What does this fold into?
Amino acid sequence: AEIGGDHGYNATNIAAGQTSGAVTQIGPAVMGMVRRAIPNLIAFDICGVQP
Amino acid sequence: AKVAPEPEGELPYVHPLPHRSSAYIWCGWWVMDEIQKMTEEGKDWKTDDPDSKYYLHRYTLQKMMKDYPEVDVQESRNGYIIHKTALETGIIYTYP
Amino acid sequence: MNSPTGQVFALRAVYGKDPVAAGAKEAFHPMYGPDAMFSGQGAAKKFPALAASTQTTVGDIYTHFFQETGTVYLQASVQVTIDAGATDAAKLDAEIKKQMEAGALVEIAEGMATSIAELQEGFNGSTDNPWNEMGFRIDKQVIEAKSRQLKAAYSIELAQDLRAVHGMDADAELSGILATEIMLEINREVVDWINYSAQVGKSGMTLTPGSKAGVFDFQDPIDIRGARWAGESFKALLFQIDKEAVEIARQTGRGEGNFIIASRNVVNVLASVDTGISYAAQGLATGFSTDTTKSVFAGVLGGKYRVYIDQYAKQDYFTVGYKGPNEMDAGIYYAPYVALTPLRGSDPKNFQPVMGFKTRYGIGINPFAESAAQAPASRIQSGMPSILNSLGKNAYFRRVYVKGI
Amino acid sequence: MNSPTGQVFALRAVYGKDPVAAGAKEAFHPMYGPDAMFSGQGAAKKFPALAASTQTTVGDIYTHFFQETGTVYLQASVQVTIDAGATDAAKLDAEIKKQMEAGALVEIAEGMATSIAELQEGFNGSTDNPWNEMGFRIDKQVIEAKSRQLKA
Amino acid sequence: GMTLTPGSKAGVFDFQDPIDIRGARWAGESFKALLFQIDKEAVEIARQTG
Amino acid sequence: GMTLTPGSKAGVFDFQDPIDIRGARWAGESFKALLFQIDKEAVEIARQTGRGEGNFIIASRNVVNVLASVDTGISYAAQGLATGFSTDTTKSVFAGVLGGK
Amino acid sequence: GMTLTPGSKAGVFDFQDPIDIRGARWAGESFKALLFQIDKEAVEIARQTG
It folds into this structure.
């Protein structure tokens, strides 16, 4: 019975396409990349500059 | 009759007023309600309940009336300055 | 999802030549400030750490790392001892903060001398002075779909009797009921995660020092800041909401809290106070849909937060959360894959029909959710929520219980 | 009414395989929350009823039904006892509320694995994994027309 | 039940009880306290009927 | 120094101490007391530097939040959801212009 | 009768009795008590006369 099965919910087996069934997956799709936001400065309208 | 046990330091500031032998401190409505709660089951507010959640403002007031004969303590519900013998009873204006 | 098992990458910048090393510090961080002497003098000398009962010389610089607020370098203004009675890390932080406020230790950042700078990495026959390089990591989290299903199992006799007496189809209704409950149940799951993964509000930086560490009470004058009468007490709740949302902005590093989920009592309190900056007011509920029958979304609070009513709230609460304009900058992902697939059949032994439904959705967490971990483990992590990585850790939500309404 | 003694019918959406049974719950009850894991994990395993004297286990999940606000499933994050002194329902509900506020017992709801729900109710030679079911009950309420009169 | 502020008298609204009027003063605020109590009851009606 | 109130805490402005908040009741006025403290600090800057009143505030999130939740002008007692200032350290550190000054 | 607050003086509205003035403060709020009292008397005339 092509009980296709399902992953073990283990992160590696989800990524690897490893499933407990007869069909082995391609890959874990993709949803985009989350980067750490770059913090904003305070500039120097608070202190001198004098290059 | 008895002395209220001393609860460490950090006593709220009492302003000396030698102009009339009086003194001013802002207590708030919670104390003026709590002390109003105190004098309804026969209890005492000068020295009873040493482990109170609001004992500190109660202890300072007791010494303040001894130091000053006509203390001027102001609440916040109406902001009135009840005097020492006006503070004696614990019933301020109304209510059970 | 177009196929089960979605995945999402996450790029982190960390410094020290080693993107992947035990205890590398993430460079850009919503909470942790930069090692402001990492590129400067910290690339010339290594400063002794601050520890419990560490006697202080005057003029030396000591590093430290509060659990919040990141790295900091403190110069000593007066010789002191750190009171190793604060052996615990959180107590160490409390001691160091007390000393800093006392002015004994004050933070400083500096650059490196030119005579040291120009020789970096053995120019002019020096040695042992490498540069303070940086790098980036890139890991990924993966999210696999679960399923959810139900059955009806009625009989044809019931169908005939129902269509005859009441005219109800006796099949569609069942399917309706089935689908309804399933969808309803799915919704509940999501909400519970929001409450489940919520951080404890009213605590840490949002905690007024005189309050009860996580619960906002309308009887405590410390919480209502001495307000009398309802017209002024409720604006204290407004201020509490503001504190929680601001702290979310701090920990998340994406934005202020922009939605609020709260019970009927809290929402009705909100709808009956003049939300904007005003003197004091209280009356009938006008600005919000306080009944959970026309809709659950009750309104917009002051143009900032969308307010939703949890009609099944157990005691009383509000939870402030952030949901960015982008779909990824979310905190929690409800990612449907198959929607309410129906199935029909009958029992061959008695011809009596059976109705059923099944769906596969799954649900995942935003990476960076903990917001206090510079770098994850194993680089391929389980995006699905659990106790190890979501229970009171997801900084995107903060939950506070309200008593005394 | 164009006839005396009218009657009305009430349709109650009740889950639990037997619409007319003791202890059956109404599915869309306004006071009572949905059985959030009825169609999810609750169809794969049965969560222990959280009653007096229980010793909670970190990570484990319990079930309860409050007299108000309805059903709930509680994952325990700290090993606590539930104050066996509680006997009646109100006392137990209040104690569970105290524990929930304490953060040692947080509500939860989860979906069910595909590798399970694929085999539900005896597929592929499996056994002892019935689906969860729901039907409706429909009961009857009747009134009679009393009268009233006067003379001049 | 849900409509009780923990210190009240469970079914009677007393204009002399601070918990019932949320601590209001004079007639300007006490009446608004009555309005809020009415709002609370309507909310509970929405809750129980659905 | 001369910014002290005689009964204050000498270096920390405490919202719970009635001496510092000038006897204010409730929140819409205990906040105004903070604005008054800011003004006194700036005037002492003008005294000590000899160049004029201080014109900028570097403050943590909570201070800015309480600043943005009151009517900063001379306009009775008022309080509500913070709207006049940007408390997001995500959008910009620069909170805004308090009182136009 | 119906015009009586259970704490009042039964036929005299007293500006010194806190039950009568609804706990008002200064003359701004203490007179509005007499306003409300006149409203109650008008209502009772409506009830008795019909």
Notes: Chain E touches chain G at residues 15-16, 25-28, 30 (CB under 8 Å).
